Paper text:
Contractile bacteriophages of the family Myoviridae (i.e. T4), R-type pyocins and the type VI secretion system (T6SS) of Gram-negative bacteria are evolutionarily related nano-scale injection machines that puncture target cell membranes using a shared contraction mechanism. TssA subunits are enigmatic as they possess a conserved N-terminal region of unknown function, previously identified as ImpA_N (PFAM: PF0681226), whereas sequences located C-terminal to this region are highly divergent. Consistent with this, phylogenetic analysis has suggested that the TssA family can be subdivided into three clades (TssA1, TssA2 and TssA3). The structural studies presented here show that TssA1B, TssA2A and TssA2B possess structurally diverse CTDs that lead to distinct overall architectures for their respective complexes.
Nested deletion of consecutive helical segments of TssA1B CTD revealed that loss of α15 resulted in the failure of the protein to assemble into a high molecular weight ring, and structure determination of the construct H12–H14 (helices α12–α14) and of that consisting of α12 and α13 alone (residues 303–347), revealed them both to be dimers. In the assembled Bc TssA1B CTD ring, analysis by PISA32 revealed an extensive dimer interface (~950 Å2) between monomers in the different layers, which principally involves the interaction of residues located in helices α12–α13 with their two-fold related subunits forming a region of hydrophobic packing with hydrophilic interactions at the periphery.
Author numbering:
A (entry chain A): 302 to 358
B (entry chain B): 302 to 354
The structure:
């Protein structure tokens, strides 16, 4: 019974933290971490970095 | 508040269910589901399977 997205993300981040702490090098740690990065407006940041890199239009 | 592994796996599964339902077939749903699948794989299995040639 997870009610909203904000709470789902917090909980995803807590799970990633746990597995990082107890099984740092596992698949489950790696995937949970990548899931967490995909939960957090990641196309915005990426585009910004692509543009910064081109330097111009 | 995460106090044992079984509980981390349950939270992980519930997160997978939430993103599956709300943002089906998004990167987050896929990765969280896949993490939930691989959470039950023991060390003696994944240590070889990750680098199977």
């Amino acid at each position: 019974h997870i009610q909203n997205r904000a709470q789902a993300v917090d909980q995803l981040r807590a799970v990633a933290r746990y597995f990082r702490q107890t099984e740092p090098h596992s698949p489950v740690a790696y995937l949970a971490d990548k899931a967490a990065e995909w939960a957090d407006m990641p196309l915005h940041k990426w585009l910004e970095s692509v543009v910064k890199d081109d330097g111009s239009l």
